[PDB]
Design a protein around this nucleic acid. Sequence first.
RNA 1: GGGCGUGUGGCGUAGUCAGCGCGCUCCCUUGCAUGGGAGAGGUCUCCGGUUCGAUUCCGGACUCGUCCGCCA
RNA 2: GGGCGUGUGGCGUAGUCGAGCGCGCUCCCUUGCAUGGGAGAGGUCUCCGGUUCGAUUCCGGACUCGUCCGCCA
RNA 3: GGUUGCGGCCAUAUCUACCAGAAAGCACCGUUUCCCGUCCGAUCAACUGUAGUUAAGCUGGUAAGAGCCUGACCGAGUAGUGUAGUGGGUGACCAUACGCGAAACUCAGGUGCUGCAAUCU
RNA 4: GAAGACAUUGUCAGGUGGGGAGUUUGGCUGGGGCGGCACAUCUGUUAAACGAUAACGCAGAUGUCCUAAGGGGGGCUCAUGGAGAACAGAAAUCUCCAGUAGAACAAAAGGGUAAAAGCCCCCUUGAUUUUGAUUUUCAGUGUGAAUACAAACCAUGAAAGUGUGGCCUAUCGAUCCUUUAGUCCCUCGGAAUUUGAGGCUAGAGGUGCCAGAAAAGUUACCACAGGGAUAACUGGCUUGUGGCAGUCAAGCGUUCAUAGCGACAUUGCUUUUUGAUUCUUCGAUGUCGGCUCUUCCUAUCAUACCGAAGCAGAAUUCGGUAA
RNA 5: GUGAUUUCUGCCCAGUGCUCUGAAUGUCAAAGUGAAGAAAUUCAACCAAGCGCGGGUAAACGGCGGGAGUACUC
RNA 6: UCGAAUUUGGGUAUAGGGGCGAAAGACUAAUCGAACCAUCUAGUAGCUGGUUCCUGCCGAAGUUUCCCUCAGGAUAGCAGAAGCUCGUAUCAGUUUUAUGAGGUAAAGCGAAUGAUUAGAGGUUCCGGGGUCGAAAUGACCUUGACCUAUUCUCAAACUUUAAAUAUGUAAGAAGUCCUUGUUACUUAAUUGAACGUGGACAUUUGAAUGAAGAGCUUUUAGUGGGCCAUUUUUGGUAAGCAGAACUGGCGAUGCGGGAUGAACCGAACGUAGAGUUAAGGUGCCGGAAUACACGCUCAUCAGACACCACAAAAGGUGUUAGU
Lengths: 142, 159, 103, 218, 58
Amino acid sequence: SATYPMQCSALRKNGFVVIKSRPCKIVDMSTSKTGKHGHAKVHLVAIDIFTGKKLEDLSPSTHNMEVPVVKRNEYQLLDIDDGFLSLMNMDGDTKDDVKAPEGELGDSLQTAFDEGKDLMVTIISAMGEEAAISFKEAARTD
Amino acid sequence: GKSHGYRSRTRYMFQRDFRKHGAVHLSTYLKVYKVGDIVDIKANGSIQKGMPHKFYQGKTGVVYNVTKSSVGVIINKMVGNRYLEKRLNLRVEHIKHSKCRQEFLERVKANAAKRAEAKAQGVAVQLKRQPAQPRESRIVSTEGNVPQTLAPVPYETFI
Amino acid sequence: VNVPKTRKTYCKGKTCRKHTQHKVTQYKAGKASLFAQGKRRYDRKQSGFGGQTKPVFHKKAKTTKKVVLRLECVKCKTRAQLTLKRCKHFELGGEKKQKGQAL
Amino acid sequence: ARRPARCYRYQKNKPYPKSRYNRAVPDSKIRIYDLGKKKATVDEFPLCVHLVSNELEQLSSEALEAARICANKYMTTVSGRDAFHLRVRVHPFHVLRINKMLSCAGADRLQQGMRGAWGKPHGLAARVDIGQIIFSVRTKDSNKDVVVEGLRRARYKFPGQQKIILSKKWGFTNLDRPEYLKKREAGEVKDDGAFVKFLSKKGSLENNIREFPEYFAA
Amino acid sequence: AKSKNHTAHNQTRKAHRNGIKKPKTYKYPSLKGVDPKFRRNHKHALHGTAKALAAAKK
RNA sequence: GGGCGUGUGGCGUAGUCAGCGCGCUCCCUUGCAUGGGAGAGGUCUCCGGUUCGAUUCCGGACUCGUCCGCCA
RNA sequence: GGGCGUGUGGCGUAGUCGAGCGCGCUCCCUUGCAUGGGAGAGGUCUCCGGUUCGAUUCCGGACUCGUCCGCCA
RNA sequence: GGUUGCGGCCAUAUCUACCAGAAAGCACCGUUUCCCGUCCGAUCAACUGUAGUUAAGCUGGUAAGAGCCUGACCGAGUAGUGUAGUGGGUGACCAUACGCGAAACUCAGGUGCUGCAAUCU
RNA sequence: GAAGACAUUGUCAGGUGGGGAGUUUGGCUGGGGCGGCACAUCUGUUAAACGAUAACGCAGAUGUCCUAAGGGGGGCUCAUGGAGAACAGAAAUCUCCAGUAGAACAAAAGGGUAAAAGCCCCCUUGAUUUUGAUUUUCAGUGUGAAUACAAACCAUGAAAGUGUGGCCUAUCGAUCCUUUAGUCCCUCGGAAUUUGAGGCUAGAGGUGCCAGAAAAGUUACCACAGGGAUAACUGGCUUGUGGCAGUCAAGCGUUCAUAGCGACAUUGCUUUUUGAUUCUUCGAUGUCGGCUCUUCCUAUCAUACCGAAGCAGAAUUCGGUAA
RNA sequence: GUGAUUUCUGCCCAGUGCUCUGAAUGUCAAAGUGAAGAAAUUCAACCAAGCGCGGGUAAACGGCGGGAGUACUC
RNA sequence: UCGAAUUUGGGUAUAGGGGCGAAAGACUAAUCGAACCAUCUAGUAGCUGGUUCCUGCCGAAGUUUCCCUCAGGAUAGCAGAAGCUCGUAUCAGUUUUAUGAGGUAAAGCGAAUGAUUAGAGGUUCCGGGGUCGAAAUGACCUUGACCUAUUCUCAAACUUUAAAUAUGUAAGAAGUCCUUGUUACUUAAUUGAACGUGGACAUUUGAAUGAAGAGCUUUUAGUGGGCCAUUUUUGGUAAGCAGAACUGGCGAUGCGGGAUGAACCGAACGUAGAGUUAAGGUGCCGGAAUACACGCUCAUCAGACACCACAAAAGGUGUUAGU
Ligand SMILES: [Zn+2]
């Protein structure tokens, strides 16, 4: 399956959750007892990985929250044209479906490709939507 | 939690033995079982197929079915307040003939031989077994066997 | 896991009755039709006032599904199904494991 | 901070050695087991005296250490540091557990009682039997009165009842005094670092002649 | 409110009240579980034996 | 008392069974702005186990920061 | 009340059993919006005993200070 | 009785170090055209039984040999244990009654037996 | 006058809507809550040598992984140690010897395995079809897992044979609904054809609280049925902890074990500490402290009479009879 | 909402609300439109408000941290 | 507090999820965190209480499995009733004989795994510290490793060995032997497999003891909180604590004894008479020897009977007997 359930108390920091059908990454967790007799409630503060928005939800601790599958994958650039990166996989597979980043990451990547470094791109998959998060340079195998 | 698997608590029961591990000798494959034979069940840990359950280890039963590599055996199992009939398909490495049955058949044939030979005279055959009777009168002599007097020994440390 | 795209297996297609070649796919469920009797009964029951009238499942526990291979005989086009055990990763593309080569 | 020994006097549990299921025990307090002139030869010290139990109980390693120090100190003060050989013939292998309860006021607010009351290791003890030797000392016949008094001083540190028995054996061996004498007049004994190796009628004659030559020198 | 978990007390007394009857054995036990190739021939063998005995004592 | 997190070169940290950036110190290049290249620098908190191999997998220990310890 | 750790020159602070630096100011030299430089003084290493050959250093005790946990319904 | 082929029980048969082996049989041994397999006719494959040798394999013997096997009134009726007592003892534990009964140790002996077929001074 | 086929009104449809309505808000548990999962399972042990056997007992593990890590066949022998060979050393590759497994077999543990069940190579799909029987758990129900056959059709090998997934013991899921495969068979009931729908046989989509409800809190404004099956007092058992007392004597005390003390050990007593437990009380035994008042205990602070001193006197310390 | 007078009411619009005369295909009902079909029907395009994007707002609910150097600075 | 945001009469308005409230969840006819009246309504309750005559006979369970199951049910077990088919057996909480199976108690570690004390002899291209050495893969000592032969002590999750007690099967007529019929199974083959025909072997017909009738079926009650004692045993310092195994009890049970007491000892019960006893006793209470015999003990806290209602370490020219 694309996504799998988990418990709120089983969740911990720097883990992925589904909040309002968005892949989110937790920055804050806090548990407070509801009433003296009652079970504690978990208040979760998380950041969407793709959009960067801050989303929070509180739930019972025993409640089950949905968790996405996030895969980070490593590729080499071939060209940046029309806002669409062209990447090259190990064993020689090529994809052009990735859109170029639109922020300061995209600006730095564009300048780095213009001045000619060999750039290593990390793109993540979660719940059927695809994006690029970071780039490095290959220190060896020039 | 608790654990009651199929081979739970079978450690020393299904160890092989000391210094007779390895492959099994060919007498167990050359032995012949017929329907109605009485067999003892002792599992061989070297053979994992056709294994009996740990309840039937050391149990004795009757053959009711003969197939290519296995034998069907009938055991009586106490369940609650009665015995139930259990049918087991066991490979022939896990069974051997019961020796008490062949001893009893030897008694049957020797007993019939005694009855047949003594029927020609009518000498009160007395064919039933009898248990250990009390030993009868005897005279023990002291020729070279004069009694030796014994006494209790005093106490010592002995360390 | 990895499963090859073809398989020689038994075909009970009333003309083969033997092992023939089969092309394998993965089973997909297909869209739930309207005008199925349970769907019509559910729509009729849900119409009106009363709110939700049937249970909706929440306490999901499995993370995997059993995969089902759809075998299709190449001679007489008859189809078979067979299920496998639970696997997190599945592929039909045959990239065979090779032994004495580097990491 | 240590419980009294009456809480662990009796052999109430199965033996609980340090193993790969314990993995966290305190080390024993007794560490030295052979003392006095431990490098002495076998015929230096013919007389042997035993401190032997009359109880079936557990002796603490702390009590073993205290009795060892007491007997050693007394005998080295009255008779010299190298006039005896003392050997502690028990080893603490049983591990004692404690289910530690809080001694605070209002502890029941956070105690949980007897739930999950499996203990933690805190000590080591040696399980002895009826007629089992705790202490064994070998010395000359001129030190009998001081080794009996040393064992009698050491007996106060032990719970239960112990007896002081003068053994009929030669030293730390297992033969009697005249048996060892009639064995050592022949060459069929040969000394080791502290003990002695004996001749047997079995084995290869070449090895039996490179060792033990004086007996075959008949 | 904990309670007793399990015991086997009184169970053998309850069994031995009117208990431990051995199962009734019969001539001609059931042939279920016996090998079908054996039973398929055994049917024809008994059929031929019955026909021969009927022709003998007809 | 119990639970959770924490230690990576000075800092930020990332990670597959030790990388850069900014610091540091040199060298080179060219402003309006610079940039580049070298090095010295890390027992991945520590100690074990597992594993071909462990930052990574596990166990134990230390430090620090948190959160609970309530009804009578 | 109990536990744990702490104690260095006028001040702060470094100490593997063989008391240094910085700050205050003593003097001299040297200077507007007042500096710098050079030689100074300064300890019973909290105290008392033992070990050593000699304890800041090791150990035991005492004093002092700082943390932590503790009464009732 | 020796040897070979196929065995059964699977150390009384194994291991260490020496010694001996008539005859026959095994064995080492000679060769690479063909079948076949290797980096390598070393193993495996094929050919010759010729050129040779008991050196080895194998078999047997030796050793106050290691191991293993058997037995003992050897330890020892010991340890342990079923049953009993308004038995002893503060207890820990221990005696007795009616029964069952070890292991280590010590000592003594032994070191393959045998089935089917073939063949041999 | 204004406005005008737009507002309004009617019916549907989307949004909003604690303003209001109805309802829910697991279990085990040395009381409940927090914690944990002992809630479905597996290995060793507790477990007392058939089997069965508990605790929030101990040490761990499971919700996976594998087209080979399945099936068949062939060849070979592993961990380790010793002795050698350029670069090459503690660890690179090669050679010999010893090597009962001290290695490996996906994972936890326990069994099993040496011309193999291990390592390498070759060929494959039996991880196939059809329904029965049996073993474990057990009500001799289900589910899961497994065993031996029958009837086919295959794989492999020279062949005997072996193979119905993983060397064995864990690795998982009812009714209703949807969907797929097969039969292309049965029915749509006034008679037909074609769509559509409904049936039969076998799978999948999942209930982990794992024989399977669709589910947030608070109440110090509170209510009812009950419970001493169950906590917060006293009392009772126990005495870890608290308090008090001994025995031994390495030392302190200038010298000197014991005038006075006394380490390392060890034997006790008490119920004025706090725990542990849950026996009594939940159709109620009034729950802190103080004031007032009586009596009892002695482990004696003072007073009486004494013994000892590191008791010259003075002051003091230790101890005895004594409440 | 705060609670006479006096004296002041600092910083923060990221969150939750509230609010725009902004910009306009992302989400996108019924009716209506188009295609296929023999029809039931299926599939698309188009698609109002509100969400989503972009602003404002704290006398709205609220909030007001760490590591170094020498109160101050980074 | 008392000249006003004053006090108050009468009239009038607001009515129950509604009113009114300078706000206390206050007031709304002694009723308010949702008034009162009637009806639905004899609402439901796995929860508490009660449940009405006698005698006779039989007579339990607190255990298995599943359940939002843990104060409840279902199911199996225990029990009663109705019997039915037969007439001494296709029996047995027992023993013997023969034959299996087991890994506990014990034992073992100069046997494997693991822990562990001490020396001895060796190994240095093959250790580390010192001293002598120009240095040296130098030397001399010392200390660590590894090997060899020993030595002391251990193991719930170690083991070569290995009990006792429990535990499977057999001790015939449904058996044994001889001969030959069937088959589509099987074999090279009337070879074998299974079931048969005909014939022979009978009261010692195949060990002991006892049988009280043996076998079979239907239906249904109550129960599904248990507790105690000896022995084995787990957690705990321990407990009149918590949790298991086998048996016997109490619950459900009176009687004699333990003064007294659910469980201990003895023994189980119709109504009476006589005799004899069990366990326990025989100074008096109190029925029964102030019996007999040999010793021991004198306590300025004697001692006096199992369960059981407590006492230890350490001492004593008290006294007695011993080595
Ligand atoms: Zn086909």
